[PDB]
Design a protein around this ligand. Structure first.
Ligand code: HEM
Length: 446
């Protein structure tokens, strides 16, 4: 009497499974898998057996599982050298959870007003460097803008001014260390891998220096770094500069390409839909004539723009595979998923289920008005994941993007360099953004 298990896609290659076809187009693949096998569908990545949970029901099973059924550890094994050993997600389930819990208040509530001012200020700042008119690569602009605003808010002014050029190069070497051989996490050593390892060492050095310099000086700035210094375990014991360095890098990687890509898409989508450029522009111009400046209070209630960002995240979730190891038999929609196996959510797929998002392929922000399609189901729309391990900085992300767009749109008029339909997702990236050659034209407003 064997229990009903989920269907397995007729395999491809012996030691490769489906990996090449999947790798060709991860999204197209997962769409195809679901379309042919339904809510719960097994495929093989190398040796390993992945199970795609799509739809409201199967998504709930995923996001609500205890940390003791589904472990996010292996998904991050490529990151461990960058984050440090035993720092966060390499740490024991209970220790990992305290570190994450220390971040949450750093990225919500009280510091949010300060972050707003810093982010607004940082964009206003760089915008003074701009010619009257010109052509820029939109993706590069939002990646620069995001790393500046992030690092200022998360690390502090030290890393924007005094440690600017030093940090810039560390982050590069850190970023460059994200190579899928390390993602297997099988062998750590290589030329680029040491330049990665050297980078983390030098950052932990820079951190401790600033810890010590901010302590003998009675500087008290508002940043995640400062709050991680002031945080403490339930022990009463404190974070070591190893941990503080690990958590700050995790936060920056978690927030950088995700935000930068989304800001790009919010501008692209607004620039190929004049209808919505007007609704957003009218909202901003209204915001200024009611506040005379971009202000934490003003950013809070931008319904037009919130709705646009929400639809952009429906059509363009930057993270499209959320992977977990099954370390306990749990059951999804009747089908039993064996321990030792892998499960994963696919925001990009579930977001196009017609039963959840009527006319899924149509861009319509008005889905997210009081007669909504994001509220009355919590495991439909899932761009920020869900459950115990949902994004800590969804609030930060929303303000970051609302601020950048507000300022850019208020000072500058934009128009696409190439044909509107030519702007496509590049699903072959670890974090999905628009295609690399993503040019745009600016000219000072009025
Ligand atoms: C802007 C668009 C963003 C999107 C779409 C996004 C999406 C996500 C998703 C889907 C996860 C869960 C991954 C998983 O379940 O394995 C996640 C986790 C996380 N995100 Fe984001 N994120 C964004 C921005 C940010 C920003 C700006 C920050 C911080 C500044 C941030 C910090 C985090 C952290 C710390 C986690 C780990 C939460 C945990 O596992 O407990 N994210 N994000």
């Amino acid at each position: 009497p064997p229990s009903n298990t989920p269907p397995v896609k007729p395999g491809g290659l012996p030691l490769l499974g489906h990996i090449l076809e999947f790798g060709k187009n991860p999204h197209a693949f997962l769409m195809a898998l679901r379309h042919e096998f339904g809510d719960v569908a097994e495929f093989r990545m190398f040796h390993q057996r992945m199970v795609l949970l799509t739809g409201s029901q199967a998504s709930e099973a995923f996001y609500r599982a205890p940390d003791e059924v589904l472990d996010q550890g292996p998904a991050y094994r490529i990151m461990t050298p960058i984050f440090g050993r035993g720092v966060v997600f390499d740490a024991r389930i209970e220790r990992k959870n305290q570190q994450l819990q220390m971040l949450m208040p750093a990225l919500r509530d009280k510091p949010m007003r300060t972050y707003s001012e810093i982010i607004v200020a940082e964009v206003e700042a760089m915008l003074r460097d701009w010619k009257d008119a010109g052509t820029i690569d939109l993706l590069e602009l939002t990646k620069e803008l995001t790393i500046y605003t992030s690092s200022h808010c998360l690390l502090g002014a030290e890393f924007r001014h005094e440690l600017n050029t030093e940090f810039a190069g560390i982050y590069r070497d850190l970023e460059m260390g994200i190579q899928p051989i390390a993602y297997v996490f099988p062998n750590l050593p290589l030329p680029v891998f040491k330049r990665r390892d050297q980078a983390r060492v030098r950052l932990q050095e820079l951190v401790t220096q600033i810890m010590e310099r901010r302590a003998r000086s009675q500087e008290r700035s508002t940043n995640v770094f400062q709050m991680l210094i002031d945080a403490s375990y339930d022990d009463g014991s404190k974070l070591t500069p190893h941990e503080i360095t690990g958590m700050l890098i995790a936060t920056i990687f978690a927030g950088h390409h995700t935000s930068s890509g989304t800001t790009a898409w919010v501008l692209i989508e607004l620039l190929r839909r004049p209808e919505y450029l007007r609704r957003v522009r009218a909202e901003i111009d209204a915001l200024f004539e009611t506040h005379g400046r971009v202000t934490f209070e003003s950013l809070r209630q931008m319904p037009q723009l919130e709705n646009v960002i929400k639809e952009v995240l429906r059509l363009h979730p930057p993270l499209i595979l959320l992977m977990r190891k099954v370390m306990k038999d749990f059951e999804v929609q009747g089908m039993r998923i064996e321990a030792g196996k892998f499960v994963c959510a696919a925001p990009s797929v579930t977001h196009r289920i017609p039963e959840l998002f009527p006319n899924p392929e149509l861009f319509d922000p008005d889905r997210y008005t009081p007669e909504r399609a994001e509220d009355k189901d919590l495991y439909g729309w899932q761009a920020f994941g869900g459950g115990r391990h949902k994004c800590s900085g969804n609030a930060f992300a929303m303000f970051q993007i609302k601020a950048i767009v507000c300022v850019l749109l208020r000072n500058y008029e934009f128009e696409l360099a190439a044909a509107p339909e030519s702007y496509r997702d590049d699903y072959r990236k670890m974090v999905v953004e628009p295609a690399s050659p993503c040019l745009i034209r600016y000219r000072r407003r009025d």
